[PDB]
Amino acid sequence: SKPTDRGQQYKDGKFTQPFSLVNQPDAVGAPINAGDFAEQINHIRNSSPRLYGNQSNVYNAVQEWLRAGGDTRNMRQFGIDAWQMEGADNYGNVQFTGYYTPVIQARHTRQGEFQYPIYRMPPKRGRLSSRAEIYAGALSDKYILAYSNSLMDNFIMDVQGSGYIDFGDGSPLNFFSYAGKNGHAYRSIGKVLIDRGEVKKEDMSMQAIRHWGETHSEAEVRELLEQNPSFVFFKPQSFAPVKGASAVPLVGRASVASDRSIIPPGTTLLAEVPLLDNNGKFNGQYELRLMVALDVGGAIKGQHFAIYQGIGPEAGHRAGWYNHYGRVWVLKTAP
């Protein structure tokens, strides 16, 4: 009928088209991240001048509006048009998921909870070993780059093809990028979990898999992870700020991944974002934020948005592990 369990609301009427112009967005107050927004825009300015030139007109109007007070009731003064998105149910409830840059805690020697090795490219003979055999010690220790404290975290890193490591000694954050793969074709761990009815298809994502790994034992996670005989190898790489497909450095909660054919890179968004409690559940509150589409995702389609939460543990907690809903207005300036 009309569920509200995940942030849904139904006080903006029913929509008959993807985007609908509104006199004033149904959102009281002003955006709370004016500073991050400005910073995000500065990154587009320097990192993607082409994209900036094509959108500066909108960015400028928004900035002018923000400096003048930023209240949503005064947007028209600056020629800013608000096109509300119908969302997933045509009631304006836009599907939100989150993602962030994990910082894996690892050490140079296996100690305490640090028992899970991350490897660099071994010789051809070594690459024939399956994930299960490698977990069993098939590979020499000379090929270990570090020992993380999470088996599932390593796997998520394998899927990404790279990741950041903190050795916890005050040295610079370490980055490792894709070096190669082992000789076994990979299998979808997400599929396995859906089959075992452990996770709903609609809520499946890397975050969902990460959550499952935090709510299950090491034995259970290893049993699951071996279902995928494939394995990834890395190599040291110089540090580079996290960027989206658009090649622009991403600012936490001021940028999202979107479907290019629906929300082109550079598009400005005003959004009522749902907040989550410690159990990743909608706590009944929303934050008004400005964000820019600067990334894409294999499973981010339609009017679905993945909010980049940032880097580290706090960003992770805000990410969540299943869908939630808020309202979003595309900001533009009538020519």
Side-chain angles (χ1 to χ4, degrees):
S1 57
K2 288 186 178 181
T4 63
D5 184 280
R6 294 181 164 188
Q8 307 91 314
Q9 293 210 315
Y10 309 91
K11 47 196 70 176
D12 288 321
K14 190 174 183 182
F15 297 79
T16 66
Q17 50 182 59
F19 308 84
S20 303
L21 211 200
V22 302
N23 285 305
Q24 287 180 181
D26 179 27
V28 78
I32 69 174
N33 67 335
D36 297 330
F37 179 71
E39 187 194 323
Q40 182 64 87
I41 301 308
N42 188 230
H43 280 309
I44 299 174
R45 185 195 290 277
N46 301 318
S47 296
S48 191
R50 188 191 90 283
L51 191 59
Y52 180 73
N54 292 157
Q55 307 284 163
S56 60
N57 180 56
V58 176
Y59 300 159
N60 284 167
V62 172
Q63 284 292 278
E64 179 66 2
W65 160 55
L66 293 175
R67 178 177 62 172
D71 199 82
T72 58
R73 306 274 299 193
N74 302 316
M75 299 174 78
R76 293 281 208 204
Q77 301 182 195
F78 310 93
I80 299 170
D81 288 328
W83 298 78
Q84 185 164 9
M85 298 175 72
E86 53 173 24
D89 58 9
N90 296 341
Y91 274 108
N93 296 308
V94 179
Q95 185 194 345
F96 277 112
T97 51
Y99 70 115
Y100 72 113
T101 302
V103 173
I104 291 176
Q105 283 299 317
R107 303 296 184 258
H108 294 297
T109 65
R110 81 169 65 230
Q111 39 177 285
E113 287 168 348
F114 304 100
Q115 303 302 322
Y116 318 101
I118 289 175
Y119 306 76
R120 62 186 176 86
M121 274 287 264
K124 60 170 66 295
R125 174 63 61 190
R127 270 121 64 178
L128 281 310
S129 303
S130 62
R131 176 174 289 276
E133 307 172 314
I134 296 175
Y135 282 166
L139 299 180
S140 171
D141 283 7
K142 54 196 290 181
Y143 299 124
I144 295 183
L145 293 168
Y147 295 96
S148 91
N149 61 351
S150 177
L151 193 61
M152 184 60 87
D153 287 358
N154 287 21
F155 172 61
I156 291 181
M157 178 178 170
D158 296 320
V159 179
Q160 185 79 175
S162 61
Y164 299 75
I165 281 60
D166 175 11
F167 283 112
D169 59 10
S171 66
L173 211 207
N174 287 263
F175 181 53
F176 295 99
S177 69
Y178 182 77
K181 219 181 71 53
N182 77 335
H184 291 261
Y186 55 54
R187 290 195 213 288
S188 176
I189 291 294
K191 166 177 172 54
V192 177
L193 290 172
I194 292 173
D195 291 339
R196 298 178 180 181
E198 300 258 36
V199 183
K200 272 194 172 181
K201 315 72 182 303
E202 307 72 58
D203 300 306
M204 183 50 74
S205 72
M206 289 311 288
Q207 275 310 95
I209 293 180
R210 177 183 291 277
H211 184 68
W212 185 93
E214 304 178 310
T215 57
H216 289 76
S217 63
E218 163 59 8
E220 286 165 343
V221 168
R222 178 165 174 175
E223 191 292 305
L224 174 63
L225 258 37
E226 299 188 322
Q227 295 307 294
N228 164 51
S230 184
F231 198 78
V232 180
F233 303 105
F234 308 87
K235 67 175 172 185
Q237 181 113 302
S238 49
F239 175 89
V242 179
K243 305 176 183 176
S246 64
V248 183
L250 309 181
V251 176
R253 286 174 290 183
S255 58
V256 305
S258 76
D259 181 343
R260 292 208 195 74
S261 67
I262 304 301
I263 305 295
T267 306
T268 303
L269 314 170
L270 175 63
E272 283 289 4
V273 184
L275 295 191
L276 309 179
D277 63 11
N278 288 79
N279 298 314
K281 176 222 266 292
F282 172 52
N283 66 26
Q285 312 173 198
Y286 308 82
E287 290 189 320
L288 190 58
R289 291 178 179 280
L290 283 163
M291 310 183 291
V292 185
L294 297 166
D295 202 11
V296 294
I300 301 303
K301 307 300 182 184
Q303 300 211 337
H304 177 189
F305 286 122
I307 304 178
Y308 179 68
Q309 288 295 337
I311 179 170
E314 295 308 298
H317 297 308
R318 290 196 296 282
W321 47 282
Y322 64 78
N323 307 296
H324 291 98
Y325 304 83
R327 284 87 63 201
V328 179
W329 293 268
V330 169
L331 304 187
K332 288 182 173 180
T333 51

